[PDB]
Amino acid sequence: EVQLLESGGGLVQPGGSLRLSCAASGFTFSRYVMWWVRQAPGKGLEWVSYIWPSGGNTYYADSVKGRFTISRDNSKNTLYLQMNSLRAEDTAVYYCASSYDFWSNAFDIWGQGTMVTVSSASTKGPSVFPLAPSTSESTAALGCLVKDYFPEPVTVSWNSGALTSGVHTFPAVLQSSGLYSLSSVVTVPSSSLGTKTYTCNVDHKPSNTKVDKRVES
Amino acid sequence: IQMTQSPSSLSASVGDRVTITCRASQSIGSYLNWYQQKTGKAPKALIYAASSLQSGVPSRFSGSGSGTDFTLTISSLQLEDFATYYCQQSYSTPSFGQGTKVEIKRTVAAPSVFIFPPSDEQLKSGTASVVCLLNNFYPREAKVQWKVDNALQSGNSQESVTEQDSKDSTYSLSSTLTLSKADYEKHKVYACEVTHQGLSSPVTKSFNR
Amino acid sequence: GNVDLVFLFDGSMSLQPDEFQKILDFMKDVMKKCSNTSYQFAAVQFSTSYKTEFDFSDYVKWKDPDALLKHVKHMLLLTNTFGAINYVATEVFREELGARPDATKVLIIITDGEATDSGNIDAAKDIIRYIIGIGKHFQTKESQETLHKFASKPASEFVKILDTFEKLKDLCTELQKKIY
Ligand SMILES: [Mn+2]
């Protein structure tokens, strides 16, 4: 199949720079106009730049002109975006995309996206607390409170990903402190609470912080 | 070129016929395309050139229109179709409509409610979170009240809601009450009271510290 | 000197709207300019697929370039030029649809660059093929190869630019050329 895979996203302080890459596979990359398109959280799709097949001509949205530079390496089938002088408003998911029919203004193939966060706040791993729930016979609920981390995201699984059914991991809310928190819950049979241990596996890749927390009765 | 999409959101039952419109500020002939975007995913082309369905895309999707006014139709809405839909003019350099969020309408479902005291671990710091959980309900609209020794709380709770479940179309909701270690030890009875369309009277779940 | 001429014109979305309108206008201008009985015209739009918008017999019955192209629906999909040329060679130059056995066969392929598809156009080798370019991507190294392939030889006499070609005073005598 045809695909585009972005990489390079992360947390940058305002004024800093960051470089995104997008590897193409399964199609003749060198024939296509290539784009970067971004989406701020809960907002619409905004094209910020594109580049002709040969890579001579380049183009930029007024929001990014002078600060970002698009380029491509047709020999490795890779597309690049150098972002400089980064502002808070540049925080978004960044996609690469190809032009339909080589150079139309419709989009053909899209990458998976890469998140960029521009903030002067520093990364911080979460604290994890149990939401505690045996001789009863109905269903019980239990969970983990994942508190006070920055930036997004954190991932949560149960029993190392073995337990997926009945899990609900809520969206992160931003607190007055400027740190995120969320809860993840799962419902299980009440009869199980004494015979199987439930462990939520929290991972905050930004802070290299992984946590396994047994939620006991 | 401004693209005005309509409506912003809609709710329809599985099997219902769904219609989304898109208006351009000038004639754009047929340079009008439709994308589907599911949560945490890239957009995906459904229709190019106003009416041309792309291979792989289910035949329940169709597009029509030319000039200024265009329409995306889903002939029979399925669970999979829960997503945001965008029109996009390719007449000049790309511009998008604001998007339409499609939710799945289902039968009413009462929440199951659970309360969670703050952990002893969190209490080591000057911090107390009390969590109320409403599980697997429909519709999304639900009211949650926090009472501390029967005193109604204000401006110290916070709600988060899951997106619609991909199998049963229900929602879940957490309400977190945040109080200082000191304020938590000052009171005994902690209760959350849930009001929802599917409940004939409010459910209160409570514990004594 | 009789000429049966087919316009094979690019309806794909890579063209800018104004560029496609220029193609429509170009075809109508040529038909209006080269209006004498020696000329007959057919027009085929191509993109992902191919549609005969009008054949030689339609042209003869109406002979109104504006009416003949009135109902063209812009395809706005991909660019299968190779399959399109083969389609013309086998499906359009027919006595069935009004082609003349004594007439010189001429194809004006109007397009903006390289094709989505590939293959061969052996079936069109007895047809005199002009390539008329429009767009900023029409002559690159990406497309040089494809355009040479489509054009009659020497390509330097058959690869043209719509913008300069349409102004030629002696356009109708040019398309009648048979020694080359
Ligand atoms: Mn094309």
User: How, if at all, do strands B203-208 and B189-195 pair?
Assistant: antiparallel
Question: In whole angstroms, what is the distance from residue B172 CA to residue B138 CA?
Answer: 9
CB-based contacts of C46, cutoff 8 Å, min separation 6 = C8, C9, C10, C11, C12, C75, C79, C80, C81, C83, C84, C87
Question: In whole angstroms, what is the distance from residue B129 CA to residue B153 CA?
Answer: 14
CATH of residue A6: 2.60.40.10
Q: Inter-chain contact A106–B161, Cβ cutoff 8 Å?
A: no
What is the CA B121 to chain-centroid distance, rounded?
Answer: 33
Say whether both A106 and A191 belong to one domain: no
Say whether both A10 and A95 belong to one domain: yes
Does residue C13 sit at the B interface (CB-CB below 8 Å)? yes
**CB–CB of A131/A215 below 8 Å?**
yes
Reduce the DSSP state of residue C83 to 3 states and report it. helix
B184 DSSP 8-state letter: H
Pick the CATH number of C1-180 from 3.40.50.410, 3.90.950.10, 3.40.640.10, 3.30.2350.10: 3.40.50.410
Q: A188 is in which domain, residue-wise?
A: 121-217
Structural domain ending residue among the three candidates A71, A87, A120: A120
Say whether both A102 and A73 belong to one domain: yes
**CB–CB of B44/B83 below 8 Å?**
no
Say whether both A77 and A129 belong to one domain: no
Say whether both A138 and A115 belong to one domain: no
A·C CB contacts under 8 A: 33
| Residue of C143, C134, C117 whose CA lies nearest to C18 | C134
A160 DSSP 8-state letter: G
User: How, if at all, do strands B69-74 and A139-149 pair?
Assistant: unpaired
CA angle C40, C45, C47 (to 5 degrees): 155
Residue type, B23: R
**CB–CB of C19/C112 below 8 Å?**
yes
How many C-beta neighbours within 10 Å does residue C163 have? 12
Q: Inter-chain contact C77–B90, Cβ cutoff 8 Å?
A: no
Distances (CA, A) of A171 to B128, B162, C39, C112: 20, 7, 70, 48
> What domains can be seen in chain B, in order of their start residue?
1-105 (2.60.40.10), 106-209 (2.60.40.10)
Q: Which helix (H) or strand (E) holds B181?
A: helix B181-185
Say whether both A192 and A102 belong to one domain: no
Q: Inter-chain contact A31–C13, Cβ cutoff 8 Å?
A: no
The domain locations on chain C are 1-180
Q: Inter-chain contact B174–A183, Cβ cutoff 8 Å?
A: yes
Q: Phi first, then psi: what are they for C164, rounded to 5°?
A: -85, -35
Q: Going edge to edge, which strands form the sheet with B128-137?
A: B112-116, B128-137, B171-179, B157-161
Q: What is the largest CA-CA distance in chain A?
A: 72
CB-based contacts of C118, cutoff 8 Å, min separation 6 = C82
**Tokens 């419902």 appear where?**
A187
**Counting every residue, how long is chain A?**
217
Q: Given C12, C114, C140, which is nearest A54 (Cβ)?
A: C140
How far is the centre of ligand 1, averaged over its atoms, from the C-alpha of C136 (Å)? 12
What resolution in angstroms does the PDB record give?
2.3
**CB–CB of B206/B188 below 8 Å?**
no
Q: Which helix (H) or strand (E) holds A169?
A: strand A167-169
Q: Inter-chain contact A106–C78, Cβ cutoff 8 Å?
A: no
Angle between helices C81-91 and C141-150 (to 10 degrees): 10
**CB–CB of A170/A181 below 8 Å?**
no
Does residue A126 sit at the B interface (CB-CB below 8 Å)? no
Contacts 24+ apart (CB under 8 A), B192-195: B192/B113, B192/B115, B192/B130, B192/B132, B192/B144, B192/B145, B192/B146, B192/B147, B193/B144, B193/B145, B193/B147, B194/B111, B194/B113, B194/B132, B194/B134, B194/B142, B194/B143, B194/B144, B195/B142, B195/B143, B195/B144, B195/B145
Question: In whole angstroms, what is the distance from residue B90 CA to residue B4 CA?
Answer: 15
Question: In whole angstroms, what is the distance from residue B33 CA to residue C77 CA?
Answer: 11
Say whether both A53 and A83 belong to one domain: yes
**HSE of C35 in the Cβ direction (CA atoms, 13 Å)?**
8
Residues 77-106, chain B: which have Cβ within 8 Å of C?
90-91
What is the CA A37 to chain-centroid distance, rounded?
Answer: 15
Which chain B residues are closer than 8 Å to C75 by Cβ?
A: 49
**Bridge partner list, C50:** C46
Alpha-carbon dihedral B177, B181, B187, B191, rounded to 10 degrees: 20
Structural domain ending residue among the three candidates A62, A87, A120: A120
Reduce the DSSP state of residue B179 to 3 states and report it. strand
Method underlying the structure: X-ray
**Tokens 């329809």 appear where?**
B12
